[PDB]
Design a protein around this ligand. Structure first.
Ligand SMILES: [Zn+2]
Ligand SMILES: [Zn+2]
Length: 52
């Protein structure tokens, strides 16, 4: 299982929350692989490179 990101490091951890881009792709990205901070995930709406 590979997530959505031009460069996905494919890290699998049980303590790593994921982010969805609710701008139109509905795909799931890793906060480290797509460069998101845990703070952004809970407070802001994650738009991705393709949504942007
Ligand atoms: Zn990823
Ligand atoms: Zn998107």
């Amino acid at each position: 299982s590979v997530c959505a990101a031009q460069n996905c490091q494919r890290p699998c951890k049980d303590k790593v929350d994921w982010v969805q881009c609710d701008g139109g792709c509905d795909e799931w990205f890793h906060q480290v692989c797509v460069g998101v901070s845990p703070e952004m995930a809970e407070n802001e709406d994650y738009i991705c490179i393709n949504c942007a």
